[PDB]
Structure 1
Amino acid sequence: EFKGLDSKTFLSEHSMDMKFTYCDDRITELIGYHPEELLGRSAYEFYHALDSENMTKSHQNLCTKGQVVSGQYRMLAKHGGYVWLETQGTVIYNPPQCIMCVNYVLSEIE
Protein backbone atom coordinates (compact mmCIF):
# COMPACT_ATOMS: atom_id res chain seq x y z
CA GLU A 1 0.00 0.00 0.00
CA PHE A 2 1.33 3.46 -1.10
CA LYS A 3 0.83 7.18 -0.10
CA GLY A 4 -1.66 9.45 -1.90
CA LEU A 5 -1.13 12.86 -3.56
CA ASP A 6 -2.04 14.92 -0.44
CA SER A 7 0.21 12.75 1.79
CA LYS A 8 3.12 13.37 -0.66
CA THR A 9 2.61 17.17 -0.69
CA PHE A 10 4.66 19.50 1.51
CA LEU A 11 5.02 23.29 1.67
CA SER A 12 8.34 25.18 1.75
CA GLU A 13 9.24 28.89 1.91
CA HIS A 14 12.39 30.47 0.52
CA SER A 15 14.13 33.84 0.41
CA MET A 16 14.88 35.28 -3.10
CA ASP A 17 18.36 33.62 -3.10
CA MET A 18 16.66 30.09 -2.89
CA LYS A 19 17.48 29.67 0.88
CA PHE A 20 14.97 27.79 3.06
CA THR A 21 13.17 30.07 5.55
CA TYR A 22 10.43 27.48 6.41
CA CYS A 23 9.70 23.82 5.60
CA ASP A 24 6.71 21.64 6.55
CA ASP A 25 7.38 18.70 8.94
CA ARG A 26 5.94 16.34 6.26
CA ILE A 27 9.31 16.35 4.40
CA THR A 28 10.60 13.93 7.10
CA GLU A 29 8.21 11.11 6.09
CA LEU A 30 8.98 11.72 2.38
CA ILE A 31 12.65 12.77 1.94
CA GLY A 32 14.07 12.20 5.47
CA TYR A 33 15.10 15.81 6.16
CA HIS A 34 14.14 17.78 9.27
CA PRO A 35 12.99 21.38 8.71
CA GLU A 36 15.69 22.73 11.09
CA GLU A 37 18.52 20.99 9.17
CA LEU A 38 17.30 22.69 5.92
CA LEU A 39 16.96 26.28 7.30
CA GLY A 40 19.54 28.66 5.86
CA ARG A 41 20.60 26.19 3.14
CA SER A 42 19.97 26.83 -0.56
CA ALA A 43 17.46 24.71 -2.50
CA TYR A 44 20.10 24.45 -5.27
CA GLU A 45 22.33 22.28 -3.04
CA PHE A 46 19.62 19.56 -3.21
CA TYR A 47 19.01 19.26 -7.00
CA HIS A 48 20.40 16.37 -9.06
CA ALA A 49 23.30 17.54 -11.28
CA LEU A 50 21.29 16.72 -14.48
CA ASP A 51 18.34 18.93 -13.34
CA SER A 52 20.40 22.03 -12.33
CA GLU A 53 20.09 24.09 -15.58
CA ASN A 54 16.31 23.54 -15.85
CA MET A 55 15.73 24.72 -12.23
CA THR A 56 17.92 27.80 -12.90
CA LYS A 57 15.66 28.65 -15.90
CA SER A 58 12.55 27.97 -13.75
CA HIS A 59 13.82 30.37 -11.06
CA GLN A 60 14.58 33.10 -13.64
CA ASN A 61 11.08 32.59 -15.07
CA LEU A 62 9.53 32.62 -11.59
CA CYS A 63 11.30 35.92 -10.83
CA THR A 64 9.95 37.62 -14.00
CA LYS A 65 6.49 35.96 -14.24
CA GLY A 66 5.74 35.85 -10.49
CA GLN A 67 4.69 32.19 -10.54
CA VAL A 68 6.12 29.05 -12.19
CA VAL A 69 5.62 25.29 -12.45
CA SER A 70 8.88 23.33 -12.49
CA GLY A 71 9.22 20.20 -14.61
CA GLN A 72 9.86 16.77 -13.12
CA TYR A 73 13.11 17.16 -11.15
CA ARG A 74 15.22 15.09 -8.71
CA MET A 75 16.05 16.04 -5.15
CA LEU A 76 18.75 14.26 -3.11
CA ALA A 77 17.21 12.27 -0.27
CA LYS A 78 18.60 12.22 3.32
CA HIS A 79 20.16 8.74 3.10
CA GLY A 80 21.31 8.76 -0.52
CA GLY A 81 19.18 8.36 -3.62
CA TYR A 82 16.94 10.90 -5.31
CA VAL A 83 13.19 11.40 -5.33
CA TRP A 84 11.25 12.85 -8.23
CA LEU A 85 9.39 16.06 -7.39
CA GLU A 86 7.17 18.60 -9.13
CA THR A 87 6.77 22.06 -7.53
CA GLN A 88 4.48 25.04 -8.04
CA GLY A 89 6.38 28.22 -7.00
CA THR A 90 4.76 31.60 -6.22
CA VAL A 91 6.44 34.91 -5.29
CA ILE A 92 4.94 36.87 -2.39
CA TYR A 93 5.61 40.60 -3.00
CA ASN A 94 4.79 43.72 -0.90
CA PRO A 95 2.08 45.65 -2.81
CA PRO A 96 9.75 40.53 -3.28
CA GLN A 97 9.41 39.25 0.30
CA CYS A 98 9.69 35.50 -0.33
CA ILE A 99 8.91 32.46 -2.58
CA MET A 100 6.18 29.94 -1.59
CA CYS A 101 6.60 26.36 -2.84
CA VAL A 102 3.88 23.70 -3.04
CA ASN A 103 6.00 20.56 -3.51
CA TYR A 104 4.73 17.17 -4.65
CA VAL A 105 6.80 13.98 -4.59
CA LEU A 106 5.95 12.00 -7.74
CA SER A 107 7.90 8.94 -6.54
CA GLU A 108 6.22 5.95 -4.89
CA ILE A 109 6.35 6.42 -1.11
CA GLU A 110 5.19 4.18 1.89
Structure 2
Amino acid sequence: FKGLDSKTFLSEHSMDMKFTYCDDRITELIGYHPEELLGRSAYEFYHALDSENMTKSHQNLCTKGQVVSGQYRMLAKHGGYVWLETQGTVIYPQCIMCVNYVLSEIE
Protein backbone atom coordinates (compact mmCIF):
# COMPACT_ATOMS: atom_id res chain seq x y z
CA PHE A 1 0.00 0.00 0.00
CA LYS A 2 1.33 3.47 -1.03
CA GLY A 3 0.52 6.92 0.49
CA LEU A 4 -0.88 9.69 -1.83
CA ASP A 5 2.34 11.67 -2.44
CA SER A 6 4.11 8.52 -3.60
CA LYS A 7 1.50 7.88 -6.27
CA THR A 8 1.42 11.42 -7.68
CA PHE A 9 3.99 13.02 -9.98
CA LEU A 10 4.15 16.31 -11.84
CA SER A 11 4.89 16.73 -15.57
CA GLU A 12 5.20 19.65 -17.97
CA HIS A 13 4.56 19.61 -21.65
CA SER A 14 4.95 21.95 -24.63
CA MET A 15 1.79 22.82 -26.49
CA ASP A 16 2.59 20.05 -28.99
CA MET A 17 2.08 17.69 -25.96
CA LYS A 18 5.73 16.64 -25.84
CA PHE A 19 7.15 16.15 -22.33
CA THR A 20 9.46 18.95 -21.28
CA TYR A 21 9.87 17.96 -17.64
CA CYS A 22 8.78 15.01 -15.50
CA ASP A 23 9.25 14.36 -11.72
CA ASP A 24 11.50 11.39 -10.82
CA ARG A 25 8.50 9.81 -8.87
CA ILE A 26 7.34 8.37 -12.27
CA THR A 27 10.29 5.87 -12.28
CA GLU A 28 9.02 3.82 -9.34
CA LEU A 29 5.46 3.95 -10.63
CA ILE A 30 5.74 3.39 -14.42
CA GLY A 31 9.45 2.60 -15.03
CA TYR A 32 10.52 5.65 -17.12
CA HIS A 33 13.48 7.82 -16.27
CA PRO A 34 12.39 11.48 -16.85
CA GLU A 35 15.18 12.20 -19.33
CA GLU A 36 13.94 9.45 -21.73
CA LEU A 37 10.48 11.08 -21.89
CA LEU A 38 11.60 14.49 -22.98
CA GLY A 39 10.70 15.35 -26.51
CA ARG A 40 8.10 12.60 -26.87
CA SER A 41 4.43 13.40 -27.25
CA ALA A 42 1.87 12.10 -24.74
CA TYR A 43 0.16 10.54 -27.67
CA GLU A 44 2.97 7.96 -28.01
CA PHE A 45 1.92 6.52 -24.75
CA TYR A 46 -1.93 6.34 -24.62
CA HIS A 47 -3.60 2.97 -25.07
CA ALA A 48 -5.28 2.58 -28.47
CA LEU A 49 -8.70 2.34 -26.76
CA ASP A 50 -8.15 5.70 -25.02
CA SER A 51 -6.67 7.60 -27.91
CA GLU A 52 -9.88 9.10 -29.32
CA ASN A 53 -11.10 10.16 -25.79
CA MET A 54 -7.74 11.70 -24.97
CA THR A 55 -7.70 13.67 -28.29
CA LYS A 56 -11.13 15.08 -27.22
CA SER A 57 -9.79 15.84 -23.77
CA HIS A 58 -6.82 17.76 -25.32
CA GLN A 59 -9.31 19.81 -27.38
CA ASN A 60 -11.19 20.62 -24.19
CA LEU A 61 -7.93 21.68 -22.51
CA CYS A 62 -7.13 23.98 -25.42
CA THR A 63 -10.62 25.53 -25.39
CA LYS A 64 -11.18 25.75 -21.62
CA GLY A 65 -7.65 26.22 -20.19
CA GLN A 66 -7.89 23.46 -17.52
CA VAL A 67 -9.35 19.92 -17.64
CA VAL A 68 -9.43 16.69 -15.75
CA SER A 69 -8.71 13.72 -18.00
CA GLY A 70 -10.84 11.01 -16.48
CA GLN A 71 -9.27 7.49 -16.33
CA TYR A 72 -6.79 6.50 -19.02
CA ARG A 73 -3.82 4.12 -19.59
CA MET A 74 -0.14 4.89 -19.97
CA LEU A 75 2.15 2.36 -21.81
CA ALA A 76 4.70 1.39 -19.16
CA LYS A 77 8.42 1.34 -19.90
CA HIS A 78 8.69 -2.48 -20.10
CA GLY A 79 5.32 -2.96 -21.62
CA GLY A 80 1.87 -3.23 -20.25
CA TYR A 81 -0.13 -0.22 -18.95
CA VAL A 82 -0.80 1.82 -15.80
CA TRP A 83 -4.18 3.58 -15.19
CA LEU A 84 -3.81 7.29 -14.38
CA GLU A 85 -5.93 10.33 -13.97
CA THR A 86 -4.52 13.81 -14.76
CA GLN A 87 -5.35 17.43 -14.06
CA GLY A 88 -3.98 19.51 -16.88
CA THR A 89 -3.52 23.34 -16.74
CA VAL A 90 -2.36 25.60 -19.48
CA ILE A 91 0.05 28.33 -18.49
CA TYR A 92 -0.58 31.35 -20.72
CA PRO A 93 -0.15 29.52 -24.37
CA GLN A 94 3.36 28.65 -23.00
CA CYS A 95 3.17 25.11 -21.56
CA ILE A 96 0.83 22.65 -19.92
CA MET A 97 1.37 21.55 -16.26
CA CYS A 98 0.02 18.18 -15.34
CA VAL A 99 -0.56 16.62 -11.95
CA ASN A 100 -0.74 12.91 -12.50
CA TYR A 101 -2.16 10.32 -10.10
CA VAL A 102 -1.62 6.58 -10.57
CA LEU A 103 -4.72 4.48 -10.10
CA SER A 104 -3.14 1.04 -10.66
CA GLU A 105 0.00 -1.19 -10.79
CA ILE A 106 1.59 -2.07 -14.29
CA GLU A 107 -0.92 -4.51 -15.90
Into which bin does the TM-score normalised by the smaller protein fall?
over 0.9
> CA separation in 1, counterparts of 2:56 and 2:90?
15
Change (3 A) 1:107 1:18: same
- Counterpart secondary structure, 2:74: strand
Q: Would you say the 8 A contact 1:3–1:108 is kept in 2? A: no
Q: Tell me by how many angstroms 1:4 deviates.
A: 2.1
Q: Would you say the 8 A contact 2:81–2:106 is kept in 1? A: no
Give structure 2 stretches of 5+ with no counterpart: none
- Counterpart secondary structure, 1:88: strand
- Counterpart secondary structure, 2:6: coil
> CA separation in 2, counterparts of 1:102 and 1:5?
12
Quote the RMSD (CA, aligned, Å). Answer: 1.6
Q: Would you say the 8 A contact 2:10–2:98 is kept in 1? A: yes
> CA separation in 1, counterparts of 2:57 and 2:3?
26
Q: Tell me by how many angstroms 1:80 deviates.
A: 1.0
Say which of 94, 100, 107 aligns to 1:103.
100
Give structure 1 stretches of 5+ with no counterpart: none
Of Structure 1 and Structure 2, the greater helix share is in 2
What's the TM-score, normalizing by structure 2? 0.96
Q: Tell me by how many angstroms 1:108 deviates.
A: 4.2
- Name 1:72's counterpart in structure 2: 71
| Count of paired positions | 107
Q: Tell me by how many angstroms 1:71 deviates.
A: 1.1
What's the TM-score, normalizing by structure 1? 0.93
List structure 1 runs of 4+ shifted beyond 6 angstroms: none
